[PDB]
Structures are given as structure tokens and as C-alpha cells.
Symmetry: D2
Subunit: 115 residues, 4 copies
């Protein structure tokens, strides 16, 4: 599993469950092409987005639909979504964990990259 995402809720102190996200990859004509999508599980994790063979070098974008998450809790948040954009596998295959910590008016994102 070369690309995993983990989402936490800073207001409830819990994993952020059922958060939708879409992954895009920048194509040669400079447009974002759909690559994968899913929702976080009861542990706030989304696994199995791609495989090592499919996850080639490129620029990738992960859009995390945080607005729908907060709205379903009755909160009207600041951000439309959290956006994480990065170059992947530029120096060979790696495993990427993208983490996001969510509050209504603030979020953080970090990456753990292992070889």
C-alpha cells in the first residue's frame, strides 16, 4: 500500500469517519486527471487507493472534502476542502502516508514518506 490517508477530528478527539476524498494526477497537457477516490473508515483511514505499479512518478493532488464533514456535524467551516499537492516517486518508489488534522477554521497536513 503505497498511498494511505489518515484524518483526525481536533474538536471531538476522534478519527474523522466517512470523509470523502479524490486523488488527481497531473497529465502531460497540464490538466488534473482523476486517479482514485474513497472515504475514510471507522479509524479515519483510507487504504487501497492504488498499487505500486499504477502509482508512477508525477504530481498528485489529494482533495479532502472537509466542508461536507463539518456540515454533517452542524458546523459551518471556513475551508471548502483540504488540498495536498506533491511530487511522488521522483527518486524511486516510496510509501506515502498523508495525515490531516481538522478543525472548523484550521487544518494541518503532514506526510510520512518511507523507503
Amino acid at each position: 500500500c503505497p498511498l494511505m490517508v489518515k484524518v483526525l477530528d481536533a474538536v471531538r478527539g476522534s478519527p474523522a469517519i466517512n470523509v470523502a476524498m479524490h486523488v488527481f494526477r497531473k497529465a502531460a497537457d497540464d490538466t488534473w486527471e482523476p486517479f482514485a477516490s474513497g472515504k475514510t473508515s471507522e479509524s479515519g483511514e483510507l487504504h487501497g487507493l492504488t498499487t505500486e505499479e499504477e502509482f508512477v512518478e508525477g504530481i498528485y493532488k489529494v482533495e479532502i472534502d472537509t466542508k461536507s464533514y463539518w456540515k454533517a456535524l452542524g458546523i459551518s467551516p471556513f475551508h471548502e476542502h483540504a488540498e495536498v499537492v506533491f511530487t511522488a516517486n521522483d527518486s524511486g518508489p516510496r510509501r506515502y502516508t498523508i495525515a490531516a488534522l481538522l478543525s472548523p477554521y484550521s487544518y494541518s497536513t503532514t506526510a510520512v514518506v518511507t523507503n
Copy 2:
């Protein structure tokens, strides 16, 4: 000044100086129309981006060129840029400050909305 940006550097504990950013407004065709841009000052701040008359309700994207900032310091970063996408809504008088705290493999962004 209805919209200001502040950028900080969590590695050196200083304002992030000379950071370039563009602001976009979402159009009817779901494309990003460039709206404003600048570089942060010696205090890590960017003012004068828009006016009250021009800053109408809509979805806005602030794209912060964090990769060039870290490259200038000789540090290999994870993200291509830091992206802040938000819905601007007229709920009374409101001035927006977007803050971003930068590390090579992590960033946080917060909004302070005051009257």
C-alpha cells in the same frame, strides 16, 4: 483591507519572507480566475490584495509557493505549494486573515475572521 495573509517558518522560527502567492476566484465554468498576487514582506505578511467592493461572496483559492521558499534555503520540501480554498460569505462586516505555518513536510493553515 478585507484579506491579508501571514506566513511563518517553523524551522527557523521567523516570518517567511519573499514567499510568492496567487489568489484565484472560482468562475461559473469551475475554472480558477487569477484575482491577485504578491510576495510576503519582511514581516511575513501580504496586504493590499483586494478591496471591500471587489471581494464579493464566492469561492477563493490562495496558492502559496512554498516549494520555491524551501528550495531557496537548500531544504527539500514535500508539497508543491500550500493551498487554501475557502468560501467567502457576507455575514456582517468581516476582515479575513489567512495564516500559514510552514515546515518542509507539513503545513498548517488557519483563518481569523473578525469585525
Copy 3:
């Protein structure tokens, strides 16, 4: 003003107003000697804590009463307080800003050290 504190609220996207804090300096017997205190202003800031003459090298602790802040808003928090412990070292002229970003189950703290 060699030492200032700024406190923000990540749930409401506003300065954290009326937050109490104490500052301690570590003594020779490893006890915490109270040094200064105050409450944050309408801008979420606390100034005037110390002077250059008094703010000597040493280890300092800023203890921010975040629990009472969330309790006043009717929100059950995780932390008893937010604690910032740091070594102050004379490396040229230096003014310290301690920032803290608060959520019910999470906090971040940053230092901006400038000349």
C-alpha cells in the same frame, strides 16, 4: 516588549479573548517561580509581561489556562492547560512572540524570534 503571547481559537476562527496565563522562570532548586501573568486582550494578545533588563537567559514556562476558556464556551476540553517551556538565550537582539492555536482536543504552539 521582549515577550508577547498571541492566542487563537481554531473552532470559531477568532482571537481567544480573556485567556489567563502565568509565566514562570526555573529556579536553582528546579522549582517554577512565578514571573508574570495576565489575560489576553480583544485581539487575543498579551503584552507588557516583562522588560529587557528582567528577561535574562534561563528556562521559562508559559502556562495557558485553556480549560477555563473552553468551559466558558460550553465545550469539554482535553487538556488541563497549554504549556510552553523554552530556553531563552542571548543571541543578539531578540524579541519573542509565542503563539498558540487552540482546539478542544488539540493545540499547536509556535515561536517567532526576530530582531
Copy 4:
């Protein structure tokens, strides 16, 4: 395992390995009594600090020795340590994960609390 700690390094995008920490519990005479200690593993995690029977209601403090971590990497950081203080098990037994994301001049801490 009712108390686990996870530490990440925001500069290298990796778990923070070999980070020491000490856990204290506030005694009836208002002093901090030693409770448990350990170092994070190759995955940045510290497990097996306590058991459900030993981990009674009380106020607990986790001191994470971040200064020694950065110093061993050649960085001179701002903070002496990261301090997390909280009331545990006030409404019955819970499982606590304390997470810390570290940069030289900034850190965040979050708690995931499950039943």
C-alpha cells in the same frame, strides 16, 4: 493498551525515533509523582506504558524530550520539551493516544480518546 504516544518529525517527514518521555501523575499532596517512561520505537510509537488497572482517574503529565531529539540532529530548537497535561478516566476507563508533530520552533499535540 490504554495510553499510547506517537511522535512525528515535520522536517524529515518521518516518525521521530528514540524520543524519550516521562509520564507523571498528580498526587494528593499536589506534587507530580513518576508514573511511567520510555522511548519511541522505529515507528515513532511508545506502547505498554501502563495497564487498565494501574491507570486510574487522575491528572497526568506527559513530558516529551524534544530538545534532545533535535540536538542529536544538529538543530538547536526553541522548546525544552513538549508538555501534555490532562485529566484521564474521569467518566470511566478510556484508551488515549497522544500524538505530537514536531518542528524546531513549533509543535502540535492532539489526543484521540476512544471507548
